[PDB]
Design a protein around this ligand. Sequence first.
Ligand SMILES: C=CC1=C(C)[C@@H](Cc2[nH]c(/C=C3N=C(/C=C4\NC(=O)[C@H](C)[C@H]4CC)C(C)=C\3CCC(=O)O)c(CCC(=O)O)c2C)NC1=O
Ligand SMILES: C=CC1=C(C)[C@@H](Cc2[nH]c(/C=C3N=C(/C=C4\NC(=O)[C@H](C)[C@H]4CC)C(C)=C\3CCC(=O)O)c(CCC(=O)O)c2C)NC1=O
Ligand SMILES: C=CC1=C(C)[C@@H](Cc2[nH]c(/C=C3N=C(/C=C4\NC(=O)[C@H](C)[C@H]4CC)C(C)=C\3CCC(=O)O)c(CCC(=O)O)c2C)NC1=O
Ligand SMILES: C=CC1=C(C)[C@@H](Cc2[nH]c(/C=C3N=C(/C=C4\NC(=O)[C@H](C)[C@H]4CC)C(C)=C\3CCC(=O)O)c(CCC(=O)O)c2C)NC1=O
Ligand SMILES: C=CC1=C(C)[C@@H](Cc2[nH]c(/C=C3N=C(/C=C4\NC(=O)[C@H](C)[C@H]4CC)C(C)=C\3CCC(=O)O)c(CCC(=O)O)c2C)NC1=O
Ligand SMILES: C=CC1=C(C)[C@@H](Cc2[nH]c(/C=C3N=C(/C=C4\NC(=O)[C@H](C)[C@H]4CC)C(C)=C\3CCC(=O)O)c(CCC(=O)O)c2C)NC1=O
Ligand SMILES: C=CC1=C(C)[C@@H](Cc2[nH]c(/C=C3N=C(/C=C4\NC(=O)[C@H](C)[C@H]4CC)C(C)=C\3CCC(=O)O)c(CCC(=O)O)c2C)NC1=O
Ligand SMILES: C=CC1=C(C)[C@@H](Cc2[nH]c(/C=C3N=C(/C=C4\NC(=O)[C@H](C)[C@H]4CC)C(C)=C\3CCC(=O)O)c(CCC(=O)O)c2C)NC1=O
Ligand SMILES: C=CC1=C(C)[C@@H](Cc2[nH]c(/C=C3N=C(/C=C4\NC(=O)[C@H](C)[C@H]4CC)C(C)=C\3CCC(=O)O)c(CCC(=O)O)c2C)NC1=O
Ligand SMILES: C=CC1=C(C)[C@@H](Cc2[nH]c(/C=C3N=C(/C=C4\NC(=O)[C@H](C)[C@H]4CC)C(C)=C\3CCC(=O)O)c(CCC(=O)O)c2C)NC1=O
Ligand SMILES: C=CC1=C(C)[C@@H](Cc2[nH]c(/C=C3N=C(/C=C4\NC(=O)[C@H](C)[C@H]4CC)C(C)=C\3CCC(=O)O)c(CCC(=O)O)c2C)NC1=O
Ligand SMILES: C=CC1=C(C)[C@@H](Cc2[nH]c(/C=C3N=C(/C=C4\NC(=O)[C@H](C)[C@H]4CC)C(C)=C\3CCC(=O)O)c(CCC(=O)O)c2C)NC1=O
Ligand SMILES: C=CC1=C(C)[C@@H](Cc2[nH]c(/C=C3N=C(/C=C4\NC(=O)[C@H](C)[C@H]4CC)C(C)=C\3CCC(=O)O)c(CCC(=O)O)c2C)NC1=O
Ligand SMILES: C=CC1=C(C)[C@@H](Cc2[nH]c(/C=C3N=C(/C=C4\NC(=O)[C@H](C)[C@H]4CC)C(C)=C\3CCC(=O)O)c(CCC(=O)O)c2C)NC1=O
Lengths: 164, 248, 113, 177, 177, 174, 177, 177
Amino acid sequence: MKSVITTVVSAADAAGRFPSNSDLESIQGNIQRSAARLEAAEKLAGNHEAVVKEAGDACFAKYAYLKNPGEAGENQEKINKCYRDVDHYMRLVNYCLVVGGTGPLDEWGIAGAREVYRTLNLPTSAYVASIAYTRDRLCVPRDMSAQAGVEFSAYLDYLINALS
Amino acid sequence: AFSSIQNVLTDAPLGTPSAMGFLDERTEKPLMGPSEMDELVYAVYKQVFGNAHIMESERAELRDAESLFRYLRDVREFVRALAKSNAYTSRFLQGNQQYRFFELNFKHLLGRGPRSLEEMASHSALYAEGGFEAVIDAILDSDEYAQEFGSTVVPYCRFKGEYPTNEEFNRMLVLKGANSTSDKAGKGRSKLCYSIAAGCSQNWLSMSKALPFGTEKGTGFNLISSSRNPAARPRIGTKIPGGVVFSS
Amino acid sequence: VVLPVARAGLAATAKKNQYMGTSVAPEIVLTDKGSDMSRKVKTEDKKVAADQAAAMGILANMSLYASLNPVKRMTYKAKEQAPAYVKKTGNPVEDFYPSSWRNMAPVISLSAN
Amino acid sequence: MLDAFSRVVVNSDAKAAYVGGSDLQALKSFIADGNKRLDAVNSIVSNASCMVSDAVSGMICENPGLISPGGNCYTNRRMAACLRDGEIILRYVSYALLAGDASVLEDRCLNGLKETYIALGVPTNSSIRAVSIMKAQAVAFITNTATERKMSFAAGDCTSLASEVASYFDRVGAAIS
Amino acid sequence: MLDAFSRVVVNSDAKAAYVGGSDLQALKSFIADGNKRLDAVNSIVSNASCMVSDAVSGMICENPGLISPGGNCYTNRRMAACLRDGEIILRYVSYALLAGDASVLEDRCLNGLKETYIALGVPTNSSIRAVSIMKAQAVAFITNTATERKMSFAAGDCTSLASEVASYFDRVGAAIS
Amino acid sequence: AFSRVVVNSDAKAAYVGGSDLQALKSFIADGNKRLDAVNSIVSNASCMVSDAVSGMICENPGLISPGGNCYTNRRMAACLRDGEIILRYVSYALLAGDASVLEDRCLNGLKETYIALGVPTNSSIRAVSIMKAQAVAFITNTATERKMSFAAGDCTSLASEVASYFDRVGAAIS
Amino acid sequence: MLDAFSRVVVNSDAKAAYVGGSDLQALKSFIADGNKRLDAVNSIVSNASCMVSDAVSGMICENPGLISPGGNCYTNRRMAACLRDGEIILRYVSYALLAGDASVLEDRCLNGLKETYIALGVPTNSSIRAVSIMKAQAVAFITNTATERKMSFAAGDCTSLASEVASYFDRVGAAIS
Amino acid sequence: MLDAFSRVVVNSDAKAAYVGGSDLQALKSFIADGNKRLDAVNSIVSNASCMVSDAVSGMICENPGLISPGGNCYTNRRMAACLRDGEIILRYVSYALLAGDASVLEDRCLNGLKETYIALGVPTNSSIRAVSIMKAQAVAFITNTATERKMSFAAGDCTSLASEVASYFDRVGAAIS
Ligand SMILES: C=CC1=C(C)[C@@H](Cc2[nH]c(/C=C3N=C(/C=C4\NC(=O)[C@H](C)[C@H]4CC)C(C)=C\3CCC(=O)O)c(CCC(=O)O)c2C)NC1=O
Ligand SMILES: C=CC1=C(C)[C@@H](Cc2[nH]c(/C=C3N=C(/C=C4\NC(=O)[C@H](C)[C@H]4CC)C(C)=C\3CCC(=O)O)c(CCC(=O)O)c2C)NC1=O
Ligand SMILES: C=CC1=C(C)[C@@H](Cc2[nH]c(/C=C3N=C(/C=C4\NC(=O)[C@H](C)[C@H]4CC)C(C)=C\3CCC(=O)O)c(CCC(=O)O)c2C)NC1=O
Ligand SMILES: C=CC1=C(C)[C@@H](Cc2[nH]c(/C=C3N=C(/C=C4\NC(=O)[C@H](C)[C@H]4CC)C(C)=C\3CCC(=O)O)c(CCC(=O)O)c2C)NC1=O
Ligand SMILES: C=CC1=C(C)[C@@H](Cc2[nH]c(/C=C3N=C(/C=C4\NC(=O)[C@H](C)[C@H]4CC)C(C)=C\3CCC(=O)O)c(CCC(=O)O)c2C)NC1=O
Ligand SMILES: C=CC1=C(C)[C@@H](Cc2[nH]c(/C=C3N=C(/C=C4\NC(=O)[C@H](C)[C@H]4CC)C(C)=C\3CCC(=O)O)c(CCC(=O)O)c2C)NC1=O
Ligand SMILES: C=CC1=C(C)[C@@H](Cc2[nH]c(/C=C3N=C(/C=C4\NC(=O)[C@H](C)[C@H]4CC)C(C)=C\3CCC(=O)O)c(CCC(=O)O)c2C)NC1=O
Ligand SMILES: C=CC1=C(C)[C@@H](Cc2[nH]c(/C=C3N=C(/C=C4\NC(=O)[C@H](C)[C@H]4CC)C(C)=C\3CCC(=O)O)c(CCC(=O)O)c2C)NC1=O
Ligand SMILES: C=CC1=C(C)[C@@H](Cc2[nH]c(/C=C3N=C(/C=C4\NC(=O)[C@H](C)[C@H]4CC)C(C)=C\3CCC(=O)O)c(CCC(=O)O)c2C)NC1=O
Ligand SMILES: C=CC1=C(C)[C@@H](Cc2[nH]c(/C=C3N=C(/C=C4\NC(=O)[C@H](C)[C@H]4CC)C(C)=C\3CCC(=O)O)c(CCC(=O)O)c2C)NC1=O
Ligand SMILES: C=CC1=C(C)[C@@H](Cc2[nH]c(/C=C3N=C(/C=C4\NC(=O)[C@H](C)[C@H]4CC)C(C)=C\3CCC(=O)O)c(CCC(=O)O)c2C)NC1=O
Ligand SMILES: C=CC1=C(C)[C@@H](Cc2[nH]c(/C=C3N=C(/C=C4\NC(=O)[C@H](C)[C@H]4CC)C(C)=C\3CCC(=O)O)c(CCC(=O)O)c2C)NC1=O
Ligand SMILES: C=CC1=C(C)[C@@H](Cc2[nH]c(/C=C3N=C(/C=C4\NC(=O)[C@H](C)[C@H]4CC)C(C)=C\3CCC(=O)O)c(CCC(=O)O)c2C)NC1=O
Ligand SMILES: C=CC1=C(C)[C@@H](Cc2[nH]c(/C=C3N=C(/C=C4\NC(=O)[C@H](C)[C@H]4CC)C(C)=C\3CCC(=O)O)c(CCC(=O)O)c2C)NC1=O
């Protein structure tokens, strides 16, 4: 997992040295910003089955052709596999808000994703349209605080640039 | 004023037979009869209340407003009698905020969304001088209610094409939803409240859920941001023969 | 190609006045003995100092002004202050009643006003 | 909406239990001091239009940038809307004092109040002053510690109701902060 | 909404200033060239039905997939809605040229237009192309350099009105992009 | 959750002046009665605890016996200290109108320390109920041996206030 | 001579300067009402030790949240630093009353004070309130309407100097809001 | 490598569950105890040279059959290699204390340490004594009960950090046991 802790340890393990004053100075930033990204995480955790319903409808709104006979949303057992795979991505954003870095999105959502979606004829632009809808349906003091939305919409922008 | 969705992709609006029955001196109206009557009352109950799913022991308190409606055949007086009921204030006034009550009066009684903060603040100017009955009778006795619905038809959500602001079409699409959608799902909490007072707009997926069948519900979204930047000054140049002219 | 610490230290030196945190202030003294040739005004400059000792005549007296307010101990409620890093030993006559608070009690001495 | 008796009912409907005598002594004591609750409600609603006039114009005294050009309380239209809001917070607190429960203050007045005041651009550090100036004026007439306008009450302790109103006015202050 | 005289007095209201003779020399030349502003807007509304149908069908010419199955100007239902929309855009920029300030185009027409188009499926790159044709149609009627339709004016320059209306047509592209 | 005397180790004095008392006396309802409430107690603070401890001896005379807990003259002198320290925190609590400073600086941990030090807890019920019944009689001017000049009126609600405060001491050592 | 008293404040070093008897007599006839203005300075700077010691304690007298755990007048030194700035504000206002000019008040005391208080997290809404107590003292000392202390002055009216020292205290209020 | 935050993620990933509610309460206590952990890592790293010299010498003086001819710490080549074989183990322990989980110690030091010392012919009992002294030096520097150096801290209880670092040292002993 890419985090604040695993970055300064691996930078010192590869050099063979002890945790110095600059390595402890960056864990202080894990304390000054844990408050904002953890109440962005429990807001997402308590209201996740309502968000992935609203997000997964935005890919079947723009790309309505997927329910035609032949495409990836052809029958019913393939439609809930899209809502399952969007709930996978919202669950991994909750993990990156807990850990403090893009680790659970890298190791579990992004690495090997483009090889899988190309082999199974899944368009990556509709795993994106459900994510980009969640990013601009976010109001600044209503859904969370000011700095909780900066953190939450930065892991959504990370997944958008990684699928494109 | 052409409006490519209205009688094409939706249905036709329901209502009474004509408005010439009031000038008839041996009747009051084309008398519908109690199969042609109560299916119009089903459409007033589905429109003033949302899909509230009112029970048999809640319709018994609305017994008096229908018994007047099947003699005096005015639809506007039936809508006025249902908005002063207990069953209208226990759903839309009792556990809601003030701009949630105001934004549902525009849905239930006009079929549109409020266009302004200045139009919205004048409805709270009528709350101070007569309570909630001063808001309701001023909507009903307005000029906008007279030249769209009148005494004849139910107040339906009308796709006009020639809206006086483009934002008025957006707030109408957020307010109505699909047909499997009532208006108790938020815990109070007016949906249009941030966008009226700031001046921004709505979210594209929330509007395209409420569009009809056959109107490209959702496509057109680029995968970048959904709104506009007011501070951006782009360079848009026109080709002339010699070079490119930036008439800015 | 730019130096960020140099051209932002220079930008913060011309916009911000040099005179704020130095705590100097013009102290004016008037002398008057009634006569005409006794009436100087002296507007000299002194760095004023934070007087540490007379704040306890203000901080403590307001801390017992607000102790005895019945209706400012409600609508102005204080936060939940943690106790210090004292370790519990096991005997309750040192744990619950330590040597810093041994036999301490308030004595109230009323007089006129 | 709920009151002080109905919160005892809807907490014991959730446990499928009849309200026994072990939960009635908080309610049998409520009707015992219920006359002096009503005695202290109308000390607030009879002094109400002076309280909103004092609490707004004292917020102008502490923050004088509200009446500068570009201030939030600058012109006459924005000045009267600030006087109308402090009457509304005073109206919904004086329902919750009468009901003995903060249900009806929470979901008609405080429901989405923070997201409204951000969108309008109303400053939140000045609007908490106007609910705290009139917080101190609402514990004035209950405790009868008013400078002018002494009101003729009956003798006894009312500091339970004075502390209950100070709970209700900071429920507004925890909602718009 | 505002016009060119109301735009000056809301700039002075941020400073609580008086509109004096330094600020008035922009407004004394707005009335001095005010005959040419009226002379330019009936050069546009006299040709407005020809301007819309040439701009919409000139957008079909450079993009014939708009009228194939799956284009969003396909049937009579969709083509009449596109012809209605380009008449609305040309109406609001004739209000803005008449006032001398782009307030009424920006709040009534352009505010929220980007979200309608990404919910209804309207292509925005070709919609910008229909506005950019009738920008070039509008600057040719004002400076009287159109190939047909020479109108009868008086002699002088209208070159600051032709680039004022070109900036009003550029705000439509900036708001739906 | 104690009160605004949180000031520990900075000069400990904290008086209230003259015109600042008019900021307080126009703020406390029956503030003149409450200032006469605590002045009837702390003027007679030495006579009360000399009578409170010796009232406990007069009904329980085994405390002076060897093995008892008021033999060995320092241990007698600790009880006149702790008879007064209970009275000293109550007189501040009547002045402040709350018992939160009394519960957290005085009564906290008092039950565990009296069973650890061998203090008979049931006799200290009796010695503080004397100080309950004494200070009720001071505040209503029904003290028989000495009467204090006061303005005319009643002090019943302050007399019912201090009976709750002395019963909190009896609750905290039970 | 009056221009040289700006030079000892510009130099950021302790340098003393003064007037003679005859130079003041030429100053008190150059400026009109100059004996009244030196009584207006002497009414304040004889009581400047009590004016900050009442206004800082009067700020806690209506807001006891500043001496809370977590308050801004806590840890024994912030209370000492709060008395230091109210001493400074009373020095620069009374020098502005002595000079008759607020131009030395702005750049030497109020330039950048708004950013300095929010960098430390100083609550500026209470520091308005500690200045407005000092404004209420400065109009009471000048007009000799102070209750507990009346200095014997030569008779007449000093209403323009009290409004002038009101207006210098608003500039302290306008800069930090 | 898993830190203390990515440990509860994999604990909740196997249940396919979100992190929020009760499982977020341990992580809020980890942030609140975070300054003690940074104060604890600093106390070990600052004494790291004296920790390895005193634990290798303490192993030698108790079993003097290491500096005998043929011994495993006999020559200067074998002595400097033991002073580095234990300095690595102390380095990987402080990584596990800074993180909050032993997954940097187990996968980068312990996985293969038992099978390394068998091929090298290292005494498995003397190496346990060399890291069990270093465990006893670690709990004395965290609790500030060293008999040779005292560092300046803030007051509080930190036995949970000292008991946690003793659990890590029992893994490097059980790996080679
Ligand atoms: C822990 C991380 C993790 C993920 C992010 C997902 C990623 C993921 N999604 C799919 C799988 C899928 N993703 C979709 C989705 C879509 N198809 C459409 O019509 C639209 C493009 C879109 C709807 C949103 C569909 C239909 C499948 C199933 C494909 C198939 O079964 O052939 C698969 C193949 C295996 C399967 O069927 O589940 C994987 C690995 N799974 C994971 O384990
Ligand atoms: C943890 C993940 C998480 C998110 C990504 C966001 C996303 C999000 N937004 C909304 C819901 C909303 N979001 C807004 C947007 C705004 N409101 C305003 O006052 C502003 C003007 C504007 C922000 C600038 C509005 C108006 C609604 C209600 C209408 C709707 O979208 O259904 C909803 C539906 C739930 C509800 O009813 O509120 C969700 C899931 N919220 C979350 O909890
Ligand atoms: C608030 C004022 C108010 C009232 C006072 C009542 C009065 C009332 N009753 C009826 C309407 C009626 N009232 C009756 C009742 C009767 N006919 C008989 O033969 C019986 C003797 C008697 C029962 C006791 C019937 C049968 C109708 C319906 C007539 C019809 O079918 O057209 C109507 C007409 C509305 C309708 O068409 O249903 C009104 C106004 N209702 C009101 O809303
Ligand atoms: C000539 C320059 C000059 C001034 C204009 C004033 C302004 C001023 N005050 C403080 C510094 C301070 N100012 C206050 C003041 C207050 N906090 C409150 O709660 C009250 C409302 C208010 C006044 C009663 C406090 C408490 C500090 C100390 C801040 C701290 O210790 O963190 C500082 C120090 C910042 C620094 O050095 O970086 C300055 C410049 N003092 C000066 O030296
Ligand atoms: C900047 C200018 C400025 C003002 C306008 C006043 C505004 C003002 N008044 C009061 C204070 C008050 N307000 C009232 C209310 C009233 N008084 C009556 O006799 C009437 C019944 C009623 C309306 C006229 C009372 C009684 C007090 C005194 C404190 C109290 O008893 O609540 C308070 C402080 C409350 C507190 O914090 O404790 C303030 C800020 N003060 C200022 O500094
Ligand atoms: C129709 C409206 C209506 C009212 C206005 C009240 C009027 C009212 N108040 C009280 C009665 C009372 N009122 C108070 C209150 C106080 N005494 C004080 O000195 C405090 C300042 C203040 C605290 C807020 C007290 C303590 C009683 C006696 C308790 C009681 O009898 O219930 C009583 C009972 C006997 C009496 O005193 O007359 C009545 C009828 N009741 C009503 O039904
Ligand atoms: C695919 C099919 C197709 C078309 C329909 C036209 C569409 C068209 N018209 C004009 C351009 C124009 N169109 C008009 C309009 C008119 N001229 C008149 O005299 C009438 C009054 C009025 C309606 C016919 C004017 C005035 C101009 C610009 C002046 C000019 O042509 O020189 C332009 C140039 C705009 C630019 O340079 O970007 C284009 C592309 N061209 C095409 O390739
Ligand atoms: C009520 C309706 C109404 C109108 C339609 C206009 C009509 C109009 N235009 C101009 C007047 C004019 N119009 C032009 C304009 C032009 N000359 C050119 O060569 C350019 C092609 C074109 C630029 C757009 C010029 C240059 C003048 C004279 C300058 C002036 O007096 O403003 C005049 C003044 C001269 C005169 O009185 O004859 C009038 C009345 N004014 C009105 O009040
Ligand atoms: C019999 C005579 C007599 C004295 C002279 C004092 C002396 C004194 N002061 C303190 C105690 C203290 N003394 C101070 C000192 C100060 N506070 C400030 O803001 C200034 C900087 C400085 C005054 C110049 C402080 C802050 C404390 C509290 C604890 C401490 O910090 O030492 C203590 C420790 C016990 C206690 O906390 O009370 C003692 C013995 N006490 C006495 O009983
Ligand atoms: C109990 C709570 C409490 C307060 C409300 C404040 C008291 C206070 N006093 C004054 C008001 C004043 N303060 C002074 C200052 C002084 N008067 C003198 O005789 C001395 C020379 C000098 C230091 C004591 C003066 C001259 C006035 C104006 C006249 C007056 O009201 O006394 C003001 C401003 C105007 C007003 O509201 O009256 C306040 C808020 N301090 C507190 O502790
Ligand atoms: C040896 C046996 C012996 C006793 C049993 C007690 C007798 C005694 N006297 C009082 C009771 C009291 N004790 C005092 C105290 C005083 N009165 C004054 O005027 C002085 C100021 C002050 C010290 C003498 C008061 C005021 C009362 C209540 C009124 C009274 O009974 O006199 C009480 C408490 C009331 C009760 O009975 O519950 C007791 C137990 N004293 C003894 O010596
Ligand atoms: C620094 C030294 C210094 C001073 C302090 C002043 C002092 C001063 N002022 C005046 C003289 C005066 N002083 C006042 C002032 C006032 N009258 C009032 O009722 C108000 C309370 C107050 C205004 C704030 C007036 C009105 C006069 C008379 C007009 C004048 O001589 O200017 C006099 C003449 C007294 C006399 O008649 O003999 C003197 C000595 N001049 C100095 O050189
Ligand atoms: C035969 C040779 C021989 C030695 C070399 C020492 C080696 C040694 N030191 C300590 C024990 C210790 N060693 C240290 C380390 C240090 N203490 C300091 O003062 C320095 C700062 C730092 C390195 C010099 C500490 C902190 C302790 C714990 C107690 C203490 O010294 O305060 C222990 C006890 C470990 C245990 O409990 O198992 C041993 C065996 N003892 C021996 O018998
Ligand atoms: C960048 C490098 C960096 C550090 C070195 C630490 C430095 C540090 N340590 C503590 C603070 C502390 N540190 C300890 C730890 C201890 N105290 C003891 O008595 C034991 C000997 C020891 C281990 C139990 C304790 C108990 C506190 C008090 C606050 C707390 O418990 O969290 C604090 C918070 C208090 C303050 O800000 O002053 C800080 C910043 N933090 C950092 O960010």
